[model samples]
Target chain A: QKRAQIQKREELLSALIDGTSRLENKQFPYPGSTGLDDTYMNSLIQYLQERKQIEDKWRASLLKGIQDHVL
Target chain B: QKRAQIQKREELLSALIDGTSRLENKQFPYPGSTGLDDTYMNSLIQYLQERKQIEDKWRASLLKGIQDHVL
Candidate 1:
């Protein structure tokens, strides 16, 4: 059952990763038409930091439920 | 100019992060109707690893481009 639980947690992480599959595109720093300026760029920077923190929390919480130890 | 470039790189990272916002839902480990098993779980594991590697490489490459001495 515990092994199954591990698999479930892994599954959620996997699904989450799959949702961002485009970010994995190796082609980096494109020359784009929507041209980035300070304001636009700052928007992206803030969003990235926020998202990173959220995922970091999710990853942390997954293993947090095993609080009661058998004595 | 270099700061702008860093900002742009950060933008791309942010866009990527935004694409995965659902993964950050704090109320996690859902009890779902569609049942999961080992084989399904393994698939999720593999995809997560692949996606993670791609993002890591993108992040590393962004920093790598500043290899020249501005002297």
Candidate 2:
């Protein structure tokens, strides 16, 4: 049970960690020599979003991995 | 002399590693949220930009330190 609890918590922690990492890293596409980066950063915000879908897939994979290991 | 060279090379390597790491982990302002992340990834084309502002600062600091040591 403790292991299960730890596993569950770790999943959430890891997910958040991964998401934060994405933000810090490549949170968005390179806007490149733009007169203004607002557009770039905005696109990034959106990209952060679209990219979330991919992240969701990773989370699911982690879930599956954790479940198989815990059970 | 060899030690200095090795250290110099290591510093360069470490600089590259740090740059990649920053690209891999740049939490901006409110966006500020970075650390060792696994899910964190991007096309590399859209990675760290304004971050170069901050990163450039770090790079300068790194170079200065190297000069102090190398000289």
Best by DockQ: 2
Maximum-TM-score candidate: 2
Positional deviation of residue A2's Cα in model 2 after best superposition, in angstroms:
27
Cα displacement (angstroms), candidate 2, residue A24, comes to 14
Q: After superposition, how far is residue B66 of candidate 1 from its true place, in Å?
A: 39
Regions of candidate 1 where Cα sits further than 4 Å from its true position: A1-31, A65-71, B1-71
lDDT by residue (B1-71, candidate 1, tens digit) is 96866666676566456545423432233325554554443344344444456455443343233222110
User: Could you tell me every candidate's TM-score relative to the true structure?
Assistant: 0.27, 0.30
| lDDT of all predictions | 0.44, 0.52
Total backbone collisions for each predicted model? 0, 6
Model 2: per-residue lDDT, tens digit, B19-67?
A: 7676667644322155323223232332444553445444444434433
Candidate 2 on A4-57: residue-level lDDT in tens?
A: 776765664455455445544653365566723568657766765766675575
Whose lDDT is greatest here? 2
Against the native chain B, each candidate's TM-score is: 0.43, 0.39
* lDDT tens digits by residue: candidate 1, A1-71: 85866666455445434433434542233214564555645654564565576546544433342232100
